[PDB]
Amino acid sequence: IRVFAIPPSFASIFLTKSTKLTCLVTDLTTYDSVTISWTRQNGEAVKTHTNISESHPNATFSAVGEASICEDDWNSGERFTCTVTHTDLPSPLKQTISRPKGVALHRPDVYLLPPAREQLNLRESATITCLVTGFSPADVFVQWMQRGQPLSPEKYVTSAPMPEPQAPGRYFAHSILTVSEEEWNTGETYTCVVAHEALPNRVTERTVDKSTGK
Amino acid sequence: IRVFAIPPSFASIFLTKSTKLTCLVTDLTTYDSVTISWTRQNGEAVKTHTNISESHPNATFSAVGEASICEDDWNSGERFTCTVTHTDLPSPLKQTISRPKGVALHRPDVYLLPPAREQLNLRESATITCLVTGFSPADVFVQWMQRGQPLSPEKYVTSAPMPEPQAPGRYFAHSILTVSEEEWNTGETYTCVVAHEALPNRVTERTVDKSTGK
Amino acid sequence: IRVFAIPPSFASIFLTKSTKLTCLVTDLTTYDSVTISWTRQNGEAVKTHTNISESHPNATFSAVGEASICEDDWNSGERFTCTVTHTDLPSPLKQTISRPKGVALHRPDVYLLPPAREQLNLRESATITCLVTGFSPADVFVQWMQRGQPLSPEKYVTSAPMPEPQAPGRYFAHSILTVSEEEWNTGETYTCVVAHEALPNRVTERTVDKSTGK
Numbered sequence: 001i002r003v004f005a006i007p008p009s010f011a012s013i014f015l016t017k018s019t020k021l022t023c024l025v026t027d028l029t030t031y032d033s034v035t036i037s038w039t040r041q042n043g044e045a046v047k048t049h050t051n052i053s054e055s056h057p058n059a060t061f062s063a064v065g066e067a068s069i070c071e072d073d074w075n076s077g078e079r080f081t082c083t084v085t086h087t088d089l090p091s092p093l094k095q096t097i098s099r100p101k102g103v104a105l106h107r108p109d110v111y112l113l114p115p116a117r118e119q120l121n122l123r124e125s126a127t128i129t130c131l132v133t134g135f136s137p138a139d140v141f142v143q144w145m146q147r148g149q150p151l152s153p154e155k156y157v158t159s160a161p162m163p164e165p166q167a168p169g170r171y172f173a174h175s176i177l178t179v180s181e182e183e184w185n186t187g188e189t190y191t192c193v194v195a196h197e198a199l200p201n202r203v204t205e206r207t208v209d210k211s212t213g214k
Numbered sequence: 215i216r217v218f219a220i221p222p223s224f225a226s227i228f229l230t231k232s233t234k235l236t237c238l239v240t241d242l243t244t245y246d247s248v249t250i251s252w253t254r255q256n257g258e259a260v261k262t263h264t265n266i267s268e269s270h271p272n273a274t275f276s277a278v279g280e281a282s283i284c285e286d287d288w289n290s291g292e293r294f295t296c297t298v299t300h301t302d303l304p305s306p307l308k309q310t311i312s313r314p315k316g317v318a319l320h321r322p323d324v325y326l327l328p329p330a331r332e333q334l335n336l337r338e339s340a341t342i343t344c345l346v347t348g349f350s351p352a353d354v355f356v357q358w359m360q361r362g363q364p365l366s367p368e369k370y371v372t373s374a375p376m377p378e379p380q381a382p383g384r385y386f387a388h389s390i391l392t393v394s395e396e397e398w399n400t401g402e403t404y405t406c407v408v409a410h411e412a413l414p415n416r417v418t419e420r421t422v423d424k425s426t427g428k
Numbered sequence: 429i430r431v432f433a434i435p436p437s438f439a440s441i442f443l444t445k446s447t448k449l450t451c452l453v454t455d456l457t458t459y460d461s462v463t464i465s466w467t468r469q470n471g472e473a474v475k476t477h478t479n480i481s482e483s484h485p486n487a488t489f490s491a492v493g494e495a496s497i498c499e500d501d502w503n504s505g506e507r508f509t510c511t512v513t514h515t516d517l518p519s520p521l522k523q524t525i526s527r528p529k530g531v532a533l534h535r536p537d538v539y540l541l542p543p544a545r546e547q548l549n550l551r552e553s554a555t556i557t558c559l560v561t562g563f564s565p566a567d568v569f570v571q572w573m574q575r576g577q578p579l580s581p582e583k584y585v586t587s588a589p590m591p592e593p594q595a596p597g598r599y600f601a602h603s604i605l606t607v608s609e610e611e612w613n614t615g616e617t618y619t620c621v622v623a624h625e626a627l628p629n630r631v632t633e634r635t636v637d638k639s640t641g642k
Contacts, residue, residue, distance in 0.1 A: 111333075113343065117427065118420070119325040125380065127347060129327065131390075157379045157386075162371060166392065174373065174388070176345070178380045213330045213427060321576065362535060364628060407629060414578070415621060417631045425639065 001027045003084050005097045008074075010139035014195040014202075019074055020066045023082040023095060030061040035085035035092070038067045041078050077101045105198035106136035106170055112192050112206035114213045115184075126184035128208065130192035133172035134164060141195035142175040145205070146188055155179070185210070215241045217298050219311045222288070224353035225372075228409040228416075233288050237296040237309060238276040244269040249299035249306070252281045255292045289411075291315045319412040320384060322349035326406045326420045328427055329398065340398045344406035344420065347378060347386040355409035356389045359419075360402060369393075399424070429455040431523050433510050436502070438567035439586070442623045447502050451510040451523060452490045458483035463513035463520070466495045469506045505529050533626035534564035534598060538634040540620050542641060543612070554607045556636065558620035561592060561600040569623035570603045573633075574616055579605075613638070 004026060008019045023036060038046040049065025056062070069080075082095035112130045120126060132142055142158045144151045155178075161171040175192065193205045218240060222233045237250065252260040263279025270276070296309035326344040333341065346356055356372045358365040372389040389406065407419040432452045441447045451464065466474040477493030484490070497508075510523035541557045548554060560570060570586040572579040583606070589599040607616065619633040 111341070113327050113330070116325050116327045127325070127345060129343070129345065131341075131343065133390075153379075155379055157376055159373055159376060162373060165368065165371065172371075172390070174343075174390075176347070176379075176386070178347070178378060212332075362537070362627075362632070409629070414576075415623075415631055417629050418576075419633055425642070428639075428642075 001089070003082065003093065003095050005082055005095050007097060010137070010195070010197050011141040013071075014141045019069055019071055021069065021080060021097065022064055022066060023084070024062045024064055025084060025086075026060065026062065028061055028086050028088060029059055030055040031087045033085075033087055034061075034063045035083060036063050036065050037081070037083045038065070039081045039083075040073075043081075075099060104136045104169075106134060107198040107200070108132045108135035108140060108194055108196045108204065110192070110194050110204055110206045112208050114208050120181065120184075123181040125178045126181045127176050127178040128184070128190055128192075130175040130177070130194065130206065131172070132161075132174060132194050134167065134170050135161070135172075135196050135198060136170050137197055138171050139197060140171075140173050142173065143193055143195070144175070144177050145191045145193055148191075150193075151177075215303065217296060217307065217309050219296050219309050221311060221313075224351075224409070224411050225355040227285075228355045229357075233283055233285065234280045235283070235294060235311065236278050236280065237298075238267075238278050239298060239300075240274065240276065242275055242300050242302060243273050244275040245301040247299075247301060248275075248277045249297060250277055250279045251295075251297050252279075253295045253297070254287075289313060317352075318350045320348060320350040321413045322346050322354055322408055322410050322418065324406065324408050324418055324420045326404075326422055328422045330427070334395065337395050340393045340395055342391040342393065342404055342406075342422070343388060344391075344408075345386075345388040346408050347388075348381075348384055349386070349410060349412060350384050351410065351412055352385045353411060354385070354387055356387065357407055357409070358389070358391060359405045359407055362405075365391075429517065431510060431512050431521065433523050433525050435525055435527075438565075438623070438625050439569035441499070441567075442569040446496050447499060448494045448496055449508060449525065450492055450494065451512075452492055453512055453514075454488065454490065456489050456514050456516060457487055458489040459515040461513075461515060462489075462491045463511060464491050464493045465509075465511045466493070467509045467511070468501075503527055532564045534562060535627045536560045536563035536568060536622055536624050536632065538620065538622050538632050540618070540634040540636055542636045545641075548609055548612070551609050554609050554612045556605040556607065556618055556620075557602050558605075558622070558634070559600070559602045560622050561602075562595070562598050563589075563600070563624055563626060564598055565624070565626055566599050567625060568599075568601055570601065571621055571623075572603070572605055573619050573621055576619075 004024045006022045006024060008021055013019045046067050049067050053062050053064045077099040079096055079098045083092050085092045110130060110132050115126050115128055130142055132140055138161045140161050144156050156175055158175040159173050161173040164170050164172045189207055189209050191205045191207050193203055195203055219237045222235055227233045250263060261282045263281050267276050267278050291313045293310055293312040297306050299306045324346050329340045344356060346354060352375045354375060358370045370389050370391045373387045375385045375387040378384045378386045403421045403423050405419040405421045407417060409417055432454060434450045436447045436449055464477060475496045477495055481490050481492050505527045507524055507526045511520050513520045539559050541559055543554045558570060560568060566589040568589055572584050584603045586603040587601040589601045592598045592600050617635040617637055619635040621631060621633040623631050
């Protein structure tokens, strides 16, 4: 019997432009009188939370609610409470979560490397990489844009941010975009925008062309 | 109370030229009469396993043992059993592990991405990455060499494998490096050698030079 | 009347992936009850040997036996005996061979020699040589590949390892290839892959490209 709270990751914050915190309950039967609440530091009201999950076949229920919160209120480290009270456990248990402040803020520096000439010979693909290195949080959100229009995640793969061991603590990630050679030849300068929290404007873009690594 | 088995990766198989399988115990107290055995498909004898881990302060114990086995035996899908019998659990529990056969073979194709011209304007460093894309197995090995002698793992980080996005299913990974500039000028072709189970000679090297993008 | 034993070289070891030693018998008539046995240092069992050679027209017989043995056991200097007992020679004679330990291990340095400009003006052929120089053992497996697939041995001949003259003691070899000019223009990088037992990963490849001497 445990209750888990999912913090909104910065990839999740940046994706929908709407931060939200959830509270998933483990090992509790599918009964009624489900108590889900979200209070501020002073216990103010919250937006109504809907879309409760279904009943699991293994005699467990997870009541999932979505609540909007201000970004400045969330980034201030304000404590939120998740009070859960079911028929099995009449004692109200509070799950407290807050912003883990105090981490060093190192912005990523992105060197979007064009493919080597030994790939531009088979004319079957032309994999372009967005090397996103050296950012002190482990939360980066990389996506590619094609002539200003952002591209689908089905076309690129963003790696998990792996640590750069040369730095004391700082991670790097990478993101490749395998595209057709004829498409790479004519047009598609392929801006890769990178979303990080430690950036001055929270977005950086890098640009490439055929006549860049010449 | 669970017992976990970690399979031997081809990366460690190629690096050490000796495959070995482990079986660690979770959430079991530091008691005696620890039963650790490794049985084949026919239950043949196994190499002695030593170097049991220390007692953890949180009242849990993990008995880790190492045992040798032939190369062709492991890749043929022979099932192994991890039988555990502790003081808390007199009932013997078997943790069965085996090679997950059924994956087609595409050999890795390696495109090492060079230093570029605008990178060679600050005169402070050289950054090299070695993209290992397009191979259907997921157990690749990548290591770096300088003038034929291997380079230490303190300077390079192989990304963990991920499926390629444009293809429906095929894996990829890569590895990064950072070095100095004046070293790059005279020497250092910087071969990045990949070791894989699907290449015929099992080793492919891709090399760079000063007269590459010239 | 003599018996000849041929020790297995590393090229035969790397090719068939199973080392085996032979023992040919000279100046003995084509009679039956041919005694051919292979014993280890402790005289353990051996793999059965079949495929006996035909009877020579000059009243001599040579029984050829093939037997597998471990790589490490062969490289550790374990002595093997070739016992022969024919009708003409009832006294058993033992032919002993062993690994000639005592020579240092130096890795080859491969400099594949490219075509020349005036050579590529007749527009009729192109010839490539693969100079493997400076390796201390005398057992080198050199072969050629085209786009990763091995090339047929009808198009190349590996020399015999000859000692270098300027070096006090160090061997060298190379192998030849002749190809067409129009084929060279788009493709055929010609990785000349050399397998030598003193290399760490036991394989080096060197290749040529259109922009090699530009």
